[PDB]
């Protein structure tokens, strides 16, 4: 029970084309090949509601022009941009947005597992819609995009979600206790608690018989239910490494040993990851 | 408008009770305090369907006897055990499970974390229900519908989810394209592609201006949508580390720089974590 995926691709290199055709050989994928920018435009504006994912070679003649016209006509669909333009090393993935904010970037040699990248493009578009097109704007603002009616993106997304989404049950984490929603006092409090917990983890990490799994669980629970960005976990790890580095300096010990706790970090993050992963329904 | 949570706390210490009341002071938490084993057993029996979470102080008189009686009378609810039995000899970290398989352990100095750990305890119960009673199994199967009448649990579960669970849309990844479900040939192809990707990540990690982000995102996309566990990513990392070690040797270079690649691992796992974190709806 998985929907067909309507893929349209603007490609003018035969090698790239065949790479795509091979990767997307599964019956699930329906491929439209466009061999020129004008032909791509002609297909898009006449098949506006029949394109699930665009695959666009960035080096193709009049790329920015074609993309800009696409954005102006309101053809903003999930997309994979292959390579870059002949000045910024064409074979390699681009370092900035060319079409829109949910686009994926692939080098010409990262195409063998295209099914998974198509999954990623679709999902990311579904997550970010309405998407900031880096070709419709443009220096104006606005509030700061629009036509307010050009949010047919929403509609597209909705359509897509009927075919590529599925409902499932999740635990109602209280958004008021999310880190990003905490007032200063609470924020500071959670910060200190998480520091204390992580310090327990570090102190007992290399000790035998210490119930490591329990301390780690204690930290990870707070990280998960307060919806803490992984970077903040990293941040805590380093604040602790600083505390210990000062303690070691003062006591005349080498701080090199701190490198070992990189293994702790991995561990913790691993756990956090698996908590999110195993929480995905079905 | 938050769902009310019924907490029953068996505590015979003013300090502990105070910490609990302070941490769970919010209006959604409805606290019932039991100040003896008798009171706990009777309340638990007459209110078996009005307890969402138990909090049990492990140091309490005749603690084991009470928990065993809790099991005998069919009371199996989400739980947090606080401190250790003190019998010999800490008041903090409990090493073994003594009520059931879904219970959480909190130190008596960690009670300020209660709202998050209560969420964790409820969720962990919902995840493992019907849970494994400690005081019932000594074999590799007590357990399942022995007794059948302990479908109470399932009912409890379904009753909790209506107040603590919600429905949301998830992108439907293809299970047949998960790493573990692929035929060994497609499995090999995918493994190889992920190894290649990761090698790019390693080679370009400490290099300036390299498109490390696209590389990492590429890899992570493959890992997420093929639903690989973190152990698999670690596996890949080590397969690449062998290779690089071999190189560093037949070049005279020092291999204490392989240490630095732990950073890489962390990075990658972090990203994967974020990708899972971003995926939770609402
Ligand atoms: C907008 C635009 C134009 Br006019 C163009 O001529 C090219 C060529 C370098 C293929 C590219 Br690459 C491009 O993006
Ligand atoms: C002690 C304490 C901690 Br530690 C804490 O993390 C919070 C909220 C940020 C959940 C609150 Br409020 C609080 O009172
Ligand atoms: C600390 C402690 C120990 Br030593 C013990 O053996 C028991 C049994 C009566 C179950 C319980 Br009751 C208890 O709480
Ligand atoms: C630790 C670990 C976890 Br957690 C896991 O979910 C799996 C497979 C089910 C993908 C595997 Br294999 C594995 O090793």
From Swiss-Prot, chains A, B:
Disruption phenotype: Not essential for growth on low light, loss of circadian cycle and rhythmicity. One of its GO terms (biological process) is positive regulation of circadian rhythm. Changing residue 166 to C: In kaiA4; induces an arrhythmic phenotype and reduces the interaction with KaiC. InterPro entries: CheY-like_superfamily, Circadian_clock_KaiA, Circadian_clock_KaiA_N, Circadian_clock_protein_KaiA_C, KaiA/RbsU_helical_domain_sf. Changing residue 194 to T: Extends the period of the circadian rhythm to 26 hours. It comes from the Bacteria. Changing residue 244 to V: Extends the period of the circadian rhythm to 26 hours. Residues 165-173 are annotated as: Flexible linker. SUPFAM superfamilies: CheY-like, KaiA/RbsU domain. GO terms for molecular function: identical protein binding. Changing residue 136 to V: Extends the period of the circadian rhythm to 30 hours. Changing residue 136 to Y: Extends the period of the circadian rhythm to 29 hours. Induction: Transcribed in a circadian rhythm with maximal expression at 12 hours and minimal expression 12 hours later; has its own promoter. Protein levels are fairly constant (at protein level). Rapidly forms aggregates in the presence of oxidized (but not reduced) quinone analog DBMIB (2,5-dibromo-3-methyl-6-isopropyl-p-benzoquinone), an artifical electron acceptor for photosystem II that reduces the plastoquinone pool (at protein level). Aggregation is irreversible, and prevents KaiA from stimulating phosphorylation of KaiC. Pfam families: KaiA (PF07688), KaiA_N (PF21714). Residues 2-164 form the KaiA N-terminal domain. Keywords: Biological rhythms. Key component of the KaiABC oscillator complex, which constitutes the main circadian regulator in cyanobacteria. Complex composition changes during the circadian cycle to control KaiC phosphorylation. KaiA stimulates KaiC autophosphorylation, while KaiB sequesters KaiA, leading to KaiC autodephosphorylation. KaiA binding to the KaiC CII domain during the subjective day yields KaiA(2-4):KaiC(6) complexes which stimulate KaiC autophosphorylation. A KaiA dimer is sufficient to enhance KaiC hexamer phosphorylation. Circadian oscillations can be generated in vitro by incubating KaiA, KaiB and KaiC with 1 mM ATP. The cycle is self-sustainable for at least 3 cycles and resistant to temperature changes. A very robust clock is reconstituted with KaiA, KaiB, KaiC, SasA, CikA and RpaA; output is measured by transcription from an appropriate reporter. The homodimer has swapped domains; the N-terminus of one monomer interacts with the C-terminus of the other. The N-terminal region (the pseudo-receiver, PsR), does not enhance KaiC autophosphorylation. It may have an amplitude-amplifier function and may be involved in transducing input signals to the KaiABC complex. This domain is not conserved in all other species. PsR binds oxidized but not reduced quinones. The flexible linker and C-terminal domain mediate the interaction with KaiC, homodimerization, and are responsible for the clock oscillation function. The C-terminal domain also binds an oxidized quinone in a crystal. This is Circadian clock oscillator protein KaiA. It comes from Synechococcus elongatus (strain ATCC 33912 / PCC 7942 / FACHB-805) (Anacystis nidulans R2). The gene is kaiA.
């Amino acid at each position: 029970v998985l929907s067909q995926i309507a893929i349209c691709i603007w490609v003018e290199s035969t090698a790239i084309l065949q790479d795509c055709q091979r990767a997307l050989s599964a019956d699930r994928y329906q491929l439209q090949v466009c061999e020129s920018g004008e032909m791509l435009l002609e297909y898009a504006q006449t098949h506006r509601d029949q394109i699930d994912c665009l695959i666009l070679v960035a080096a193709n003649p009049s790329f920015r022009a074609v993309v800009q016209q696409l954005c102006f006509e309101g053809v903003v669909v999930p997309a994979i941009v292959v390579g870059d333009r002949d000045s910024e090393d064409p074979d390699e993935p681009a370092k900035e947005q060319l079409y829109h904010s949910a686009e994926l970037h692939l080098g010409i040699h990262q195409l063998e597992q295209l099914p998974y990248q198509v999954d990623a493009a679709l999902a990311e578009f579904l997550r970010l819609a309405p998407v900031e097109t880096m070709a419709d704007h443009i220096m104006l603002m606005g509030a700061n995009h629009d036509p307010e009616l050009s949010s047919q993106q929403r509609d597209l997304a909705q359509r897509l979600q009927e075919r590529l989404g599925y409902l499932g049950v999740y635990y109602k984490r209280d958004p008021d206790r999310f880190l990003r929603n905490l007032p200063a006092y609470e924020s500071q409090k959670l910060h200190q608690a998480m520091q204390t917990s992580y310090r327990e983890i570090v102190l007992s990490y290399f000790s035998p018989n210490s119930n490591l799994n329990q301390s780690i669980d204690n930290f990870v629970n707070m990280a998960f239910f307060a919806d803490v960005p992984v970077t903040k976990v990293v941040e805590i790890h380093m604040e602790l490494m600083d505390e210990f580095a000062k303690k070691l300096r003062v006591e005349g010990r080498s701080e090199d040993i701190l490198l070992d706790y990189r293994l702790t970090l991995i561990d913790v993050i691993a756990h956090l990851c698996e908590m999110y992963r195993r929480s995905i329904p079905r």
